[PDB]
Symmetry: C4
């Protein structure tokens, strides 16, 4: 070493989905919901497996309320005080499932996590996000959380390789968050030169996780519905959206609108603005209501299935044949 | 699966046509007309095989009138009332061959289609356009239209693979419309991640269709005459132009001028304006087309001369005295970028 | 078939020149002149083998006068009247070698060509430019011009393949003009979809021509000195510049100034080449770059450049 | 001839670093310092191996003062008069190690170089920069400097191939400056068509140098910390920054301000503004006549440094290298499409 990996890793861009013979009625005959039985928490899931990322500007209760109307999952950002949770939980009883409480490895975070899980029981999911998901320190933090909440479904990331995927599933995690570099506000590649193309990561990781009867989440990398579809077809059980959800009303950030061409604030989770307030800080153009964007995404996914012959999202990858595009 | 296909599919951009020794006089000695004998309708065709797409903004009678002056085909959009057809057919007797009536799988559409074919018996061509040309529901619908009009030449699409090409040809269609994703106002790839590079599609499909003694239409993907040339050389029997024809006088769209620059709208068969402007029944017609803007091009008149002109040169350059020989003489060179 | 060619043809952009160990003093110890003995006209050449393209806006006498100060060749555009030639020839006796009279296959053209060659015997070069250099109508015409002027060095193009290169050399031409598509004001690819990457063309054609003891000219495709260097290293005997020379004082076109900057029309497509001022500097800039290329590769003479060339493939750059 | 090289050379852009399981605490548990024992000068080094390029606008004493606070090396541009050196050396006693005196092959240059090395013996590094580092001439100049200062660590460049790397190491140089073309103000490729992708160059050259127990410097090509990281992982012992350091306060160039934004001129070593500003003798200093450009004013280098070192620290955490030495040893490059 250093040695170069012969096989070229490809991204969503380098690929397309080949249409296939089917018997599907209309795009409406498509069921975008899925039933999962998590390996470790032994719990069950049901709903459209698209998650709003646990970023300050995206994982907001205001956001969760809408995604809930469509059965979409939400990983609430790790900032809301125990009070807002109880408040939200109060005004939105039903939308408590399909919601995850986030947390880092930090003691403060873990203590703020317990507090919330103890207070609101309707929340059976935990979202663990460390800097380097390949850190032994993380593997242990994961186990610990496993023991302390043996019946909560655990989402832990991020990684981009099958190996660390298995390690984490065995050390206790239920869903592994796949993705390093391809994020919108994410800039690992510029600042560290470390990364891994989403598509190749998802395919490789999804495979690993599935062998252990576990699941993965395609975290970051999507800019359009097609990518989300590509992600699902690649094997992702859940697709987590960050930037694609930023810039809406229900979204976070300051509506610092420029010459008609309005721009809302969008800081990463470890950004310069997140640090100073509690990663790049960018201006996502105001997109209005998430309401439509969700209909637009689910809409696209529905078509993808029709085109491929999958009556239900579960059949999507099973019927997926990726074609390689020049550019 | 999933499985990634090893072979990289390439587009018009990834390729060029290699010049070849010939004995051609001048670009004028080139005949861009073709004679076809359709497999199922058993009918015959003759004219330049370039079709104006059946999009609201392109497949207009106003457009058809001009293309007619040059022998180009027109797939009239699925909106004109039986009256306008009647009118058009009236004022332009001759231009009724080389004209196709379009339709979706919807009952309303099919009833409106019959009405037109019964009324104007010069329109011998039908253009069937479904969302997913891979659905059995389409194969089915095609079968029906075949029976109901056993002697009309049927154009049905779209697909991008030889298999579904054969399926449709056997199911009764005469010409298969090839193309998914590459369209201008088309955005299948962005919204669904589904697509297929035009060049590879055309080559693969053209081959399939030809084996069953059928034909194909390269639908969408062309932005310049060279692409149309590339398409023909790739084996396409007909090349259908959409965006390349949008933005003209005879074209449709709103003259939404901007910054001392005259533009024109471009959406098509499945967009928000298609849904808005149509009584309903277009949602599953094509992805949901993007309503893009196209700078005002003036008269199609020129553009046509510009296209036919380019195709003529392509043939001169390759040694094809007639379009029929273009692909026969085509050798594609791969470009790095 | 129709078949796709497996081997990917690459352009100047897809490649670079690998530095090499040498004993060269300074960039000044580099000789950019070359001696050629043309296969058919049996004539001889000597000077820097870079030619100003025979385009209306580039192959001007005004341009030729300057390039002459540096030993560069000029293919005069086929428009100047027999009078201007006689005048130019008059005021610039010496600059008559390293000058070519251009012409198409058209009878009118050939007539005007004769008149000029007859009137000015100090011009020993003809530049034949047809639309499709692959047409038999051209091979023939070439054969004719050969007979009618058995001792003039003939430049004929364009083509992009070794085959047609040989055909033309045997048909009588001395230098084959290589290039279809890559031109600046050239837009063959957009309108016809026909073309061929310069680098691959030059390499392939240069090889062909050289086997028959003939020569080629890399016509079009260069945008910077490095490209010209790349072309020479690729095997081109002469490099013909069109756009890179447009937009100067001595250049043609109309100085259509806009929004604060000065531009000029370049003529296919009609494009605006921002006014660059005097060709004078551009020439020194080009020769300069070629000189460095040789130093870095170890070629003391332009003749050794390709001999010492190893192209590295680049992802981009 | 000529022939095209089959193997495609790739740049920093065509690649990424694959994360790896590790036992690292936090990004803080990473040591970015390295100990080197130079092959010829037999001297020793210790500090963070990132060097500020010896360009007029970057290798300034003002710059050196700050980089010194972080243990970064500085190749002082070859213009400062013997007086300024004296002064700098005076007011900043400690910051003399980790500083190199630059010079071209020109007599004037060498004459000036001696004068500085004699006056300030605390300066134990020499930076030799010729136009074409492949000229047998340079090789000789190198051998001469070796003899005249048998105990100074010599940095000589630039080249991009293992062969010339060995030649130079054997002729006497300690560190070989790798890089031709990829520079910011560098424009070798546009004017000469000559170049070589940084990544491939560094890997190939680093290997060569290391076999002879020598070292290399990745010169130019970096635009972000990730590139610097990529360079180190690729095998570079030192990474020299030019453009990434231009446009700061401590930087050189003219502090222009236009359209409400403040900038700084960033001219090359052989640029036109260099030849016109310099006394003479810089025309063959670097492989091409550099372009003068406007780098947007970046403020204090102070921060940029913390930002770079910061990024490198993360790269190591991600890969499992506790010490910068282990970075390449643990590096696996994933080839990327885009
Ligand atoms: N490395 C890094 N990743 C971030 C940061 N902020 C957000 N992310 C990642 O970006 C993901 C969303 O990606 P997106 O949908 O915007 O392409 C989040 O789920 C998270 O994993 C950050 O500041 N640094
Ligand atoms: N998926 C999709 N395709 C469309 C839509 N409108 C037009 N198209 C396709 O785009 C083709 C024209 O492509 P173009 O010549 O603009 O590149 C039309 O012939 C039709 O096949 C649409 O709304 N959705
Ligand atoms: N060829 C050439 N290289 C230069 C010139 N000026 C600076 N350089 C190179 O640019 C390198 C720094 O590259 P950067 O950090 O801007 O990408 C310097 O170390 C030096 O080797 C110049 O004028 N010509």
């Amino acid at each position: 070493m250093p040695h170069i990996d012969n096989d070229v890793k490809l991204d969503f861009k380098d690929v397309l989905l080949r249409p296939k013979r089917s018997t599907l009625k209309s795009r409406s005959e498509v069921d975008l919901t899925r039933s999962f039985s998590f390996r470790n928490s032994k719990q069950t899931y049901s709903g459209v497996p698209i998650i709003a990322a646990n970023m300050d500007t995206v994982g907001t209760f205001e956001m969760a309320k809408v995604l809930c109307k469509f059965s979409l999952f939400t990983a609430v950002h790790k900032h809301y005080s125990l009070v807002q949770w109880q408040e939200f939980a109060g005004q939105n009883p039903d939308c408590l499932e399909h919601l995850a409480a986030s947390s880092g490895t930090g003691s403060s975070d873990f203590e703020q996590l317990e507090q919330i899980l103890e207070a609101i029981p309707q929340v059976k999911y935990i979202c663990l996000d460390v800097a380097n998901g390949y850190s032994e320190h993380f593997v242990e933090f994961v186990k610990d959380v496993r023991k302390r909440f043996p019946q909560h479904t655990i989402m832990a990331g991020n990684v981009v390789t099958g190996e660390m995927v298995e390690e984490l599933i065995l050390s206790g995690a239920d869903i592994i968050k796949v993705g390093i570099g391809p994020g919108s506000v994410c800039t690992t590649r510029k600042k560290t030169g470390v990364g891994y193309p989403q598509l190749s990561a998802v395919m490789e990781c999804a495979d690993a996780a599935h062998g252990l009867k576990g699941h993965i989440i395609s975290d970051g990398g999507c800019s359009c519905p097609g990518d989300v579809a590509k992600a699902f077809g690649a094997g992702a059980d859940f697709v987590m959206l960050g930037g694609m959800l930023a810039g809406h009303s229900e979204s976070g950030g300051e509506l610092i609108e420029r010459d008609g061409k309005k721009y809302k604030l969008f800081y990463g989770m470890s950004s310069e603005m997140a640090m100073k307030k509690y990663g790049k800080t960018v201006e996502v153009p105001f997109k209005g209501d998430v309401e439509h964007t969700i209909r637009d995404i689910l809409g696209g996914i529905r078509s993808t299935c029709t085109y491929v012959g999958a009556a239900k999202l579960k059949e999507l990858s099973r019927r997926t044949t990726f074609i390689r595009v020049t550019q």
